């Protein structure tokens, strides 16, 4: 039902008297490839617990993606922090052209063909967030004319 892939696992460190203390962050994307995605960052003393927890969070926070023939309805730039994502729609057969992070996110949203670019900070976390935000901002002609009825 729900396919999930982790983006980056990382190990961080705080400092306590007489040592470093390690924690583990995990970025997990979940999606059905039907147009529903989700993204979460779990943090735990050990890697598996962090991954599992990240999955839990990612299933908590979801995004409904309005797919048109496997691609996006229209282009978006999105700035999250210093990170910037540029998503642009593409003709079928193109395939997903993106970095690791937005590739995973898009692919799990069920995107077949798309064109992207990462600008500014490449920091995977903020890029992921940027991507989710982009997807969260997409509209359909339907939604548009839903807004402009008046």
């Amino acid at each position: 039902d729900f396919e999930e892939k982790m983006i980056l696992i990382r190990r961080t460190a705080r400092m306590q008297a007489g040592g470093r203390r390690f924690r583990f962050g995990a970025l997990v994307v979940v999606g059905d490839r039907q147009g529903r995605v989700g993204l979460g960052f779990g943090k735990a003393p050990e890697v598996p617990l962090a991954v599992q927890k990240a999955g839990y969070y990612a299933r908590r926070n979801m995004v409904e993606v309005p797919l048109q023939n496997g691609t996006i309805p229209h282009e978006i730039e999105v700035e999250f922090g210093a990170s910037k994502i540029v998503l642009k729609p593409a003709a079928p057969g193109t395939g997903v052209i993106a970095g690791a992070v937005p590739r995973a996110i898009l692919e799990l949203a069920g995107v077949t063909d798309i064109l992207t670019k990462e600008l500014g900070s490449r920091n995977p976390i903020n890029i992921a967030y940027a991507t989710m935000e982009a997807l969260r901002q997409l509209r359909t002609k339907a939604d548009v004319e839903r807004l402009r009825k008046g």
């Binding site: 309805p73 282009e75 548009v144 807004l147 402009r148 008046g150």
Partner: protein, 138 residues
């Protein structure tokens, strides 16, 4: 004074909408009026009307928003997400008819000033004329 009256109007509208103002006045000009017409027709504003603030003419732009939302931040969706000035004083943007852009693959508009008058991208492309590219709205 105002260096760019039109850019100023667009900005007035932006600033007004982000706080969800009911309406906003902008100093009146026939050009501004012509733009506002397109805005109303395309459905970005409830409408505009000429008023008088003090002894001077103004245009009340009645703004338009989405329905109240759920979760945190109930603040409704903007009907105007993005309104941005293209041709400015000091750099002016003119496009041919083949050079006329397509905003958000059709989900937006672009306002051109042509010899056949102030038009949208669809309108001018259909009329077959290019012009000065005033702004993009989506």
């Amino acid at each position: 004074m105002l260096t760019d009256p039109i850019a100023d109007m667009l900005t007035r509208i932006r600033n007004a909408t982000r706080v969800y103002k009911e309406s906003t006045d902008v100093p009146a000009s026939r050009f501004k009026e012509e733009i506002l017409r397109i805005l109303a027709r395309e459905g970005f504003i409830k409408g505009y009307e000429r008023v008088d603030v003090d002894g001077k003419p103004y245009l009340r732009v009645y703004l338009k928003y989405g329905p109240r939302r759920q979760g945190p931040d109930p603040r409704p969706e903007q009907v105007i997400h993005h309104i941005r000035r293209i041709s400015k004083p000091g750099r002016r943007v003119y496009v041919g008819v083949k050079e006329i852009p397509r905003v958000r693959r059709g989900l937006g508009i672009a306002i051109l000033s042509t010899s056949k008058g102030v038009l949208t991208d669809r309108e001018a492309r259909k009329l077959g004329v290019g012009g000065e590219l005033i702004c993009e709205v989506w």
